[PDB]
Amino acid sequence: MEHVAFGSEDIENTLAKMDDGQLDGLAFGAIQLDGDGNILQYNAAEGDITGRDPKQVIGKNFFKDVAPCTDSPEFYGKFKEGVASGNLNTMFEYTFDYQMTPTKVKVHMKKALSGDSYWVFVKRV
C-alpha cells in the first residue's frame, strides 16, 4: 500500500508522482478534477464509498453529473472560489447521500501541484 496520510501537509507533492494504478493503492478516496469540475482521475477507494466504477465516471462532471448534493455553497461554492483564487486548501465533513445510503465523510480539497487540477480526498468518519 502507498504510505500517504490523509491530510498530510505535502500530499500534493507525493501524489504528483503517482499514475492511476498507484492511486488505487491509497488508504482514502482520491479524485482529480480540472478547473471545470471534470474528472481526470478517480481511485477505487472513492468507488468503495459511492458505488461508481472508477473508469466509468472519469470524463464526467463531478458537480453537474456525478455528485449533485455537492452542488451547494458548502462544497461546489468553496471549489469554484478556490479555482478562481488559484489557491485552495480546505477540510470539512459532509454527508454523501445521492442514490446511496447517507454516508458521512471527511473531505479535503487542495490545489494540485499541476497547472489546472484540484484534488478531492475523502475518507469515512
Ligand SMILES: *C(=O)/C=C\c1ccc(O)cc1
Ligand atoms: C453527493 O452527491 C455526494 C457524493 C456522491 C458522489 C457520487 C455518488 O454516486 C453519490 C454521492
